[PDB]
């Protein structure tokens, strides 16, 4: 299928409690493979998936130096942002950035990403052209002018079209037995009486990878989107994910309801019913 590398940067100021924590985590699709945390006793880029451990010391030293430098960079950026919004040195604030690349089944660049947010609100984003910016407000326009003067978009374009894709392809090969393996959901329907008048039918998808899935109920072949309770896809802790969808049905009408499942690991889409 298609694949992505993405890095997720979070920096959080905490006045009176030291300097802002910086954490970077790296993902290929739904699999975390590295972390860096300035609050670790000995901050270092560390492996978080088995396939990355074979990288040599040069990889770990170089990514650690980048993160130690980004740490100071994001701390100075937080000071600048506080000024751009006329905020007090009193409060805590958050700077988030995500960047990386998507490739298709042929390993070819689909698109690149570089987006930032301040206090949970979108702040500035590299456009899909990897050459121009979208700023959310007059503060982000200051950043945009600064990044235009320093040719940041050109640096990002070179990284995203080169380094990023080259390393994503490398990771996909080194971890092909997991990263390029789709695990299908194990599916079943349970029945939970509510009253004499109705019961819950719950359609389960367990143990699947990656997290992308479609899970719906139909009544007489008509989608029940508005009447379905659909929990967020949730991690099991063994790399796989879980999800369920539930509908409330009148007693005796259970056979009018069908659960439909689509996922990359399935030979074909599934249709399930309550089997009493």
């Amino acid at each position: 299928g298609s694949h992505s590398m993405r890095y997720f940067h979070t920096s959080v100021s905490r006045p009176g409690r030291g300097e802002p924590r910086f954490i970077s985590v790296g993902y290929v699709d739904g699999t975390q493979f590295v972390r860096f945390d300035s609050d670790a006793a000995s901050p270092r880029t560390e492996p978080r998936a088995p396939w990355i451990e074979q990288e040599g010391p040069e990889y770990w030293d170089r990514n650690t130096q980048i993160s130690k430098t980004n740490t100071q960079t994001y701390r100075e950026s937080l000071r600048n942002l506080r000024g751009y919004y006329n905020q007090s040195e009193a409060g805590s604030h958050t700077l988030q950035r995500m960047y990386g690349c998507d490739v298709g089944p042929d390993g070819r660049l689909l698109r690149g990403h570089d987006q930032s947010a301040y206090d949970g609100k979108d702040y500035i984003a590299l456009n899909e052209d990897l050459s121009s910016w979208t700023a959310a407000d007059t503060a982000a326009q200051i950043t945009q002018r600064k990044w235009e003067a320093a040719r940041v978009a050109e640096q990002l374009r070179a990284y995203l079209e080169g380094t990023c894709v080259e390393w994503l392809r490398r990771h996909l090969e080194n971890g092909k037995e997991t990263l390029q393996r789709a695990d299908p959901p194990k599916t079943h329907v349970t029945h939970h009486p509510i009253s004499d008048h109705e019961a819950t039918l719950r359609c389960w998808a367990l143990g699947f990878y990656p997290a992308e899935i479609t899970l719906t109920w139909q009544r007489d072949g008509e989608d029940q989107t508005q009447d379905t309770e659909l929990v967020e896809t949730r991690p099991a802790g063994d790399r796989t994910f879980q999800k369920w969808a539930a509908v409330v049905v009148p007693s005796g009408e259970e056979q009018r309801y069908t659960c439909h499942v689509q996922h990359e690991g399935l030979p074909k889409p599934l249709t399930l019913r309550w089997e009493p």
Partner: peptide, 9 residues
Amino acid sequence: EEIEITTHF
């Protein structure tokens, strides 16, 4: 590999 950003916000 990560990218190194040296220009501040």
